[PDB]
């Protein structure tokens, strides 16, 4: 029917073209004869009739007269719908300032006139004056004025001179203004600018102006001359029970406006004094302000009782306007809801449903099949039959449900499992029955939850629900490849007790021909359910070219385990079920099954497991008894000794050897130690407590205590809970956070005196409050993410490129945290991978990676892999297939079209509730601080030096004399795997070429002191060293020995203010000592405020530390929070004290000193030198003068700025940074998330860009634009013979890159409305659909799934 929506401003001509009539009077209705008032806010001769095709006069009442108006009251006859389309207007005598264009912050009018908003307010509220066409007089044009000044001027120049006040003046101004000359002069000025803030203001202004010109608009239209009224229906007048009517809001508002307008109109006849009409106009302006946005001026007008009545701004804004309430989620017919229960007799592709619900749902289908089989003539008797509920209907309903899937929904839908499908099977009762093995995916216990049904209607819909959402086709959460059909909590106890072993029970020591007769024994009751036995079993294996082959043998197993064997399908090995079968075991069982035998076997195997599990668990009967939580016989004595210890410490305190917090910490530590001892005691007294005879004497074994089983299985609870049932329940914090100083020496089995229970209450209540607030923030995060990645759909097949990124296994210097196999699985090769038999290619460059290829990589010690990412595709508007890898939740590569943005968003959002809120994330320096003073090699290999300048002292150790050196890790091949800096004067435990292993500490120093290492041995004198003048002899209490502290120029004397303290090596006598080999003197000169420890008459070595450089370093990484850390990382906030970096490669120097702060300058090798920047010198400097480095290098420390990282290092670098960071923040809390999704979010984060040189293009220089547009532009530009364009990618926070989008309705449905609608309105911004949320709004298809085929056909149409 149509295409792209368009939006613009409105002219009075446009409005009068819109409306059909004109309002005059404020009345509403009679209250007496409920026919509407004449010519008012409900008038047929304006809006239209009430009853279909019946004039209010009561003359014509039949379609015979369709289309003619009345003559006594003059009303057109038409369907009553029209009162949902026609519209009306109002005549305002005075003009009126619209308000969105006045207080949007920025102010459109405001910067249009280049005028202070305050004074513009003053004008529009009648407390000032302003000039228009001052002429050849003393005054100016924009010159605002006050009362007495106006009076004096009129006294002196009451002539042609003109100034006014009120909206008319704004109107005259704007209508007078031109735009061409404005643009010319402003461009002149911008050529002539030199100040950046001025440039910023002027460039905003010029952008707005040139846009306002390009679009076909006229500024004066920003001032309402004629206001349109909303149609009648949309402001309905509902009657209440009683002779009253439910008052709306828009009615009251319009009525107020019309009263005020009519009063003013009456006032312009008597020519009353002007103060009156001024007060009048002020009232009217404030009223129209109220109607458009009640609540943006001062105190908002109230309504009936106390609250701001709702206005149109609220009709659209907020969590309750139209967008988030009636266009993104609509209530829907054909549905219902009820309570759930279990019903384990179901195969997991079917679910219960109650008769009465069904017979209410499928009423249409029933009607149809009825009149098809010919049992009622019309629909009437049909409905009568289906209400009376006679016989045949139930059979009919069975015939129509048989194969007609349905959808089940639960309330807090987080991830796309939140809606699955099923087939019905009719049940009695009144409560939905639902299979057990899905109550984990729904995250739905049976404590009284509620679920909703939905019934697809059309045929495409049925096929969708079956081929995509039926439960069998979801055995893997798209978050991460682990299964989701994990058997949950009883079935596990079942299988557990079904497979285990004692040492001696009935039937031990016999042989069985087959699992068949095994089960036969166990039923007959002549052999225990578990007793080790030799049996025969036969297994299958597909080792051939996809072909099954059998082999049989005599295994040693347990009878029950044999019974379990009769369910495993043909293809597994046998060792998968020959152990305890906890929870992890059965999980990887199903997993291997799915990886090796397709899908159908796995489904049927899951069902059989659940059945047999419930059966044998029941036959087992694992209760819980109070005499089965054994308190160890040593709790008493341990608490006794603890009390003795705190008594000793209290004695020592009142004897005077400790302080307050000292006693505090001492006590708390010894209690904690006692706690741990108790825990170990109970765990040993339970887990293996069973000791029995074997037909010999005795031998211990794992126990049969019910609680230990219910824990070791993996069903519920663990060491922690069994602790809080047996041992003391540790310590309890208090609201202050100060942990309390007396433990709770009791436990839930014994009693509790009051105080203890009270304190535990403290704890629990604080917990609940945090649950609430954290939920809130999690939801908000999820929403924001899905509104930024919404518009990304896999749209082609092969970008055909050669870029990528590098993946390496993450190692913390020591242990490897996550292996290369896991970080690579599924994502697709970028280049080829040559074996470490170099010049021998192993795998091709453009291949998928499944598990066999994974193992092939593992079997050759693959160092790193270059892989295709998403963040660097080459697609127009889309993201190509190969660059996205295995779509988790399915085996093969992603299909051409499956949207990814949304699933990615939901996955990064879901676990979010598990994060904390207020802690301090310290996963980023645990190893940094632990390895500051000692360099940590990561992998095995020899030690290589780079630009060595060192010497081995007489102590027998190698120390380096310059920063020029670098560390490399030689491999067994000859390349470089690891690289490291070289601290000045480091300690080298190893040497060069000395083949060593990986992870070995070979260096040490003080990370707070640069050494003053010598070159050779000798003795030291006080060469150029004077106390008071140069140095000071400060006494050092807490070390015995004292030292010499350098007195800087700012503190020392003046006569030696410049004398540089020196140190020359000498012999025992003091002869002249030069540099070894060279004629140059050999005294080292001391920097300022240093600490010399040695004195006269001291022997040193070749490179011995003479003095010490006090080196301060602040590691205040306390900014880290956790969930807000995630927030800020997707926000791109600038951290508090950002570390500055190296603009361009070159040498460095200083400049002016103390301009409030210090300066810095850098000169390239051969480039533009004058670069400088102001540094607050109080920050540390990790740099020296003579140091020459490369662009993008670091200079100071602290956080690392994403902005600068982007603009300096590389897109690969920035994306790697964000992924490592956010992954660590999660994985610290232990939640697996494949990295693809974070990658795709980052991509959408950096979608905009800016220009550098116009080239031959068609843009302004200082202009912002989306990357894709300009790339496709300059591509076809270069296609012919012209010059390209220059640009720069720039990173933006999500809450911004949402708004700054081609489409606008997208934004308009997100987080605010006024800003977006106004900017778009002044822009005149056309908008194609081209996305998802749009098409969901307008209701046509979606370019995501099947809609992808549809939209391609549509685009091909033209």
């Amino acid at each position: 029917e149509f295409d792209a929506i368009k939006i613009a401003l409105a002219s009075p001509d446009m409005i009068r073209s819109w409306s059909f009539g004109e309002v005059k009077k404020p009345e509403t209705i009679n209250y007496r004869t409920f026919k509407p008032e004449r010519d008012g806010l409900f008038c047929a001769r304006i809006f239209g009739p009430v009853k279909d095709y019946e004039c209010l006069c009561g003359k014509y009442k039949r379609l015979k007269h369709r289309g003619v108006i009345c003559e006594k009251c003059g009303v057109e006859v038409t369907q009553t719908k029209v009162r949902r389309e026609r519209m009306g207007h109002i005549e305002l005598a005075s003009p009126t300032a619209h308000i969105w264009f006045l207080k949007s912050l920025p102010s459109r009018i405001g910067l249009l006139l280049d005028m202070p908003l305050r004074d513009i307010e003053r004008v529009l509220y009648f407390e000032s004056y302003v000039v228009i066409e001052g002429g050849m007089t003393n005054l100016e044009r924009q010159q605002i004025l006050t009362e007495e000044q106006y009076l004096d001027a009129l006294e002196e120049f009451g002539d042609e001179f003109d100034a006014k006040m009120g909206a008319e003046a704004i109107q005259a101004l704007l209508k007078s203004m031109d735009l061409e000359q404005e643009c010319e002069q402003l461009r002149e000025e911008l050529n002539e600018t030199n100040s950046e803030t001025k440039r910023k203001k002027l460039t905003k202004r010029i952008k707005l102006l040139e846009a306002f010109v390009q679009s076909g608009n006229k500024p004066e239209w920003m001032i309402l001359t004629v206001l349109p009224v909303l149609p009648p229906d949309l402001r309905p007048l509902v009657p209440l029970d009683g002779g009253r009517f439910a008052t709306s809001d828009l009615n009251d508002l319009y009525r107020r406006v019309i009263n005020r307008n009519n009063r003013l109109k009456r006032l312009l006849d008597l020519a009353a004094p002007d103060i009156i009409v001024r007060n009048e106009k002020r009232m009217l302006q404030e009223a129209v302000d109220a109607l458009l946005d009640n609540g943006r001026r001062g105190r908002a007008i109230t309504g009936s009782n106390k609250r701001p009545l709702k206005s149109l701004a609220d009709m659209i804004k907020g969590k309750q306007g139209r967008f988030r309430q009636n266009l993104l989620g609509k209530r829907v017919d054909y549905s219902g809801r009820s309570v759930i229960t279990v019903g384990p007799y179901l195969r997991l592709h079917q679910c219960g449903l109650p008769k009465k619900m069904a017979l209410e749902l499928f009423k249409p289908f029933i009607y149809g099949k009825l009149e098809l089989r010919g049992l009622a003539t019309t629909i009437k008797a049909a409905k009568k039959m289906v209400e009376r509920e006679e016989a045949v209907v139930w059979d009919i309903l069975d015939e129509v449900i048989r194969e007609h899937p349905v959808l089940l929904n639960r309330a807090p839908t987080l991830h796309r499992l939140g809606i699955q499908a099923f087939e019905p099977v009719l049940i009695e009762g009144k409560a939905i029955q639902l299979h057990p093995l899905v109550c984990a995916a729904y995250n739905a216990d049976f404590d009284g939850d509620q679920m909703a049904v939905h019934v697809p209607l059309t045929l495409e819909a049925q096929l969708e629900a079956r081929a995509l959402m039926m439960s069998t086709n979801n055995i893997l959460s798209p978050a991460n490849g682990e299964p989701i059909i994990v058997p949950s909590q009883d079935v596990v106890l079942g299988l557990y007790y079904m497979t285990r072993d004692c040492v001696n029970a009935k039937g031990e020591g016999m042989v069985l021909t087959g699992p068949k007769e095994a089960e036969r024994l166990y039923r007959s009751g002549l052999a225990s359910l578990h007793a080790r036995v030799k049996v025969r079993i036969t297994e299958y294996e597909k080792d051939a070219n996809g072909e099954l082959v059998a082999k049989t043998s005599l295994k040693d197993t347990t009878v029950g385990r044999a019974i379990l064997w009769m369910i495993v399908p043909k293809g597994l090995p046998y060792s998968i079920v020959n152990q305890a079968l906890g929870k992890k075991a059965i999980s990887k069982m199903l997993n291997t099954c799915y990886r090796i035998l397709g899908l159908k076997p796995t489904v049927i195997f899951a069902d059989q497991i659940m059945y047999t599990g419930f059966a044998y668990a029941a036959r087992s009967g694992a209760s819980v008894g109070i005499d089965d939580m054994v308190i160890p016989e040593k709790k008493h004595e341990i608490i006794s000794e603890a009390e003795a210890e705190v008594a000793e410490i209290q004695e020592q305190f009142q004897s005077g050897l400790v302080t307050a917090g000292e006693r505090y910490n001492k006590v708390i530590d010894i209690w904690a130690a006692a706690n741990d001892r108790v825990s170990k005691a109970m765990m040993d007294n339970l887990q293996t407590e069973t000791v029995i005879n074997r037909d010999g004497q005795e031998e211990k074994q794992v126990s049969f205590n019910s609680i230990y089983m219910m824990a070791d299985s993996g069903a519920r609870g663990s060491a922690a809970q069994i602790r809080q049932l047996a041992g003391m329940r540790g310590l309890m914090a208090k609201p202050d956070g100060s942990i309390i100083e007396t433990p709770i020496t009791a436990n839930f089995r014994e009693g509790l005196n009051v105080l203890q229970y009270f304190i535990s209450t403290h704890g629990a209540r604080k917990g609940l409050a945090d649950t609430a607030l954290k939920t809130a923030n999690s939801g908000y995060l999820t929403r924001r993410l899905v509104d930024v990645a919404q518009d990304l759909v896999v749209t082609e097949d092969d970008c055909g490129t050669h870029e990528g990124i590098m993946m390496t296994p993450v190692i913390e210097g020591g242990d490897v945290k996550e292996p290369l196999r896991d970080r690579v699985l599924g994502r697709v090769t970028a280049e080829d991978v040559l074996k470490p038999g170099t010049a021998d290619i192993l795998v091709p460059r453009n291949t998928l990676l499944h598990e066999q290829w994974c193992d092939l990589l593992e079997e050759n010690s693959v160092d790193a892999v270059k892989v295709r990412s998403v963040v660097s595709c080459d697609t127009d508007f889309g993201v190509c297939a190969h660059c996205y890898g295995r779509d988790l939740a399915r085996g093969h590569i992603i299909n051409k079209g499956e949207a990814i943005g949304v699933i990615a968003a939901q996955s990064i959002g879901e676990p979010g509730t598990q994060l904390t809120m207020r802690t301090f994330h310290i996963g980023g320096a645990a190893s940094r601080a632990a390895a500051e003073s000692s360099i940590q090699v990561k992998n095995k290999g020899s030690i290589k030096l780079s630009n060595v300048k060192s010497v081995v002292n007489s102590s027998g150790k190698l120390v380096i004399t310059s920063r020029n050196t670098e560390l490399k890790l030689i491999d067994e091949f000859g390349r470089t795997k690891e690289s490291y800096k070289v601290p000045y004067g480091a300690v080298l435990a190893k040497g060069d070429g000395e083949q060593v292993a990986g992870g070995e500490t070979v260096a040490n120093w003080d990370p707070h002191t640069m050494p003053v290492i010598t070159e050779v041995s000798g003795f030291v004198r006080f060469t150029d060293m004077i106390d008071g003048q140069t140095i000071t002899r400060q006494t050092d209490e807490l070390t015995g020995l004292s030292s010499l502290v350098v007195l800087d120029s700012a503190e020392r004397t003046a006569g030696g203010k410049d004398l540089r303290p020196a140190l020359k090596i000498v012999d025992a006598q003091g002869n002249d000592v030069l540099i070894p080999g060279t004629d140059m003197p050999a005294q080292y000169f001391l920097p300022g405020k240093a600490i010399v420890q040695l004195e006269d008459g001291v022997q040193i070595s070749s490179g011995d530390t003479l003095a010490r450089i006090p080196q301060e370093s602040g590691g205040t990484k306390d900014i880290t929070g956790g969930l807000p850390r995630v927030a800020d990382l997707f926000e791109a906030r600038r951290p508090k004290e950002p570390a500055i970096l190296a603009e361009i490669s070159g040498i460095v120097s200083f400049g002016k000193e103390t301009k409030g702060k210090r300066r810095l300058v850098i000169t390239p090798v051969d480039g533009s030198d004058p670069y400088e920047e102001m540094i607050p010198k109080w920050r540390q400097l990790n740099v020296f003068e003579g140091e020459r480095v490369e662009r993008g290098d670091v200079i100071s420390d602290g956080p690392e700025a994403p902005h600068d990282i982007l603009r300096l290092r590389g897109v690969h670098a920035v994306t790697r940074y964000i992924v490592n960071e956010v992954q660590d923040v999660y994985r610290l809390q232990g939640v697996k998330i494949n990295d693809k999704h974070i990658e795709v979010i980052v991509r959408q984060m950096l979608r905009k860009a800016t220009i550098v040189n116009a080239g031959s293009s068609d843009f302004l220089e200082g202009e912002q634009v989306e990357y894709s547009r300009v790339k496709i532009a300059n591509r076809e530009l270069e296609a012919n013979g012209k010059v390209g364009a220059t640009y720069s990618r720039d990173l933006l926070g999500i809450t911004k890159a949402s708004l700054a989008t081609e489409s606008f309705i997208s934004a308009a449905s997100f987080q605010e409305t006024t800003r977006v609608l106004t900017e778009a309105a002044v822009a005149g911004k056309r908008d194609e659909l081209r996305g998802l949320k749009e098409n969901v709004i307008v209701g046509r298809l979606i370019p995501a799934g099947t809609g992808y085929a549809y939209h391609q056909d549509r685009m091909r149409r033209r």
């Binding site: 096929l463 086709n473 099947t1346």
Partner: protein, 73 residues
């Protein structure tokens, strides 16, 4: 008589065009005549179409062929 669609996914490697193909065949069977090509089992057109797909004798190609052959008239 249908639980999963794996064989269909195999015979047409899209898992989406499956939907459209099946729907088209189903409309043919429900609106206007054109009796099915497999022994039915008192089952609805939907399952019928998926089944005739996995039998491997219906896809977009054959559909357009037979539509053209009708339109021959």
């Amino acid at each position: 008589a249908r639980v999963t669609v794996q064989d269909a996914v195999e015979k047409i490697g899209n898992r989406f065009d499956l939907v459209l193909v099946a729907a088209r065949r189903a409309r043919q069977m429900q609106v206007g005549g054109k009796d099915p090509l497999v022994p039915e089992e008192n089952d609805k057109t939907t399952v019928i179409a998926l089944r005739e797909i996995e039998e491997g004798l219906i896809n977009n190609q054959i559909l357009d062929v037979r539509e053209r052959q009708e339109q021959q008239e």
